[model samples]
Target: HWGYGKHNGPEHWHKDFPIAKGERQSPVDIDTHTAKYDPSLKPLSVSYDQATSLRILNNGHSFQVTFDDSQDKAVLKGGPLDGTYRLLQFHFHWGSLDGQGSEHTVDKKKYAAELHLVHWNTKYGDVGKAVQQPDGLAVLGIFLKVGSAKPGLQKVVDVLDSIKTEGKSADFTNFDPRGLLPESLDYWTYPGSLTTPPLAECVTWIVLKEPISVSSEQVLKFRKLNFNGEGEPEELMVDNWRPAQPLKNRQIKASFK
Candidate 1:
């Protein structure tokens, strides 16, 4: 229902998407005071086999690296997940300029960018149907801090050349998404939805408390992408992140006390 323009942006999403105004909306502010620590929480588990790493794409909304989930090649368990969730894809949300990008905020603080790794619960069988049910999708949110270029990002940034325009994608491999996470798995978990169109309220959000580092040059590489398809009016890729939604009545559960 929108792009990042004055009239068609997030504020106008609810005009077409009634659920955008739903209580379980994502990218909420994590107020530590209200977040409760559950000692029973288990450590986050991730196993991403690089062999399943298929390719990367510029899907107009963001640059995503999709996985071959034909089987359980990569899976996530523990930390709020009752069963294993198959990894489908990982993407990012950012801004047209610096410091105004990330979707989720911490104590009202926005970051330079945010990464979303989307997985589907196998209990439902397929992503198509899973994406429509509450608790069907589990998304991991990793905030990106600005600093020296992250060495782990060199491989991803290199593939940006292939997907510079909308709908473009290129084969990629040997890239382990786990290496991009922080040393600490401490995170806040909550119920939310996809930050993009459809705004499906099917996601269980696990936002990492610690952020990874990225440099201005690396951000520039991200900015090099385009939202408009080839032959269409050119639209520079940026400001693709959704604004933080209200927490409403949803509780933010922490992995530690």
Candidate 2:
């Protein structure tokens, strides 16, 4: 399995997923000083129907909250995108320890965690088709810091105990992803790939400059999840974040000056 372990971690991903070495790989370091300001990049627009949040599951890589993408109940538009993208699901990446966990670093500063809200281009029909196109996906990234408890994250944390092992899932409804966003929509955008396996270079990354707060205790709960399935060698799910990739010659544009 292409997992986040010593034997099959990010460093070894290219052996199986050749695109891991692609020039547009994700989680690249955001050098704020070097990032150019682009007023043309519009403010991001998000509309999520609470009822569309179907369930939450531990999909081996990380805990994910799947949404009903049958229709345009939840969608993302604007912000370096040409068309509305339907929300597919959302997940997170964290570390074994609080010192470092986030994927995309800001000025080389790593946060305690990171949230990825994945979406697919509507014109592509579905995620399967969208993943094949360069501009078929849009992922909104938000950094999570350790501090005061974030009420918006409490509901998701409360259900973690139920899906402690891989393949485990539970009905997760009435959760609005909008609550998890930061106050400012100002962000940095760049062309990038998926941080995980398959590593498709179809995502238009929109990483918010502001970070949301989460209590240290909440982060501890995240570490309790198991990356292994039941009856498998007990493996704690931590340090599931990929290290920063090379920026190459791509430009990182900021919505705010």
TM-score top scorer: 2
lDDT of all the models against the reference?
Answer: 0.87, 0.93
Lowest summed lDDT window (length 10), candidate 2: 43-52
Off by over 4 Å in 2: 49-51
lDDT of 1 by residue, 1-257 (tens): 48766788888888788899998897788898889998888899887754277889988888989888888888888999889799989999887777778999888888989999899999899999998889899998999988877887889987798888988989886678877888888999999998877899999999999999898988889998898898898878899888889889889999987
TM-scores of the candidates are: 0.96, 0.98
Task: Write down the worst ten-residue block by lDDT for model 1.
Answer: 46-55
Error of 2 at 234 (Å): 1.4
CA RMSD (A), model 2? 0.9
Candidate 1 Cα outliers beyond 4 Å, as residue runs? none
Kindly list the per-residue Cα lDDT of model 2 for residues 144-213, writing each as its tens digit: 9999999988999999999999999999988888889888999999999999989999999999999999
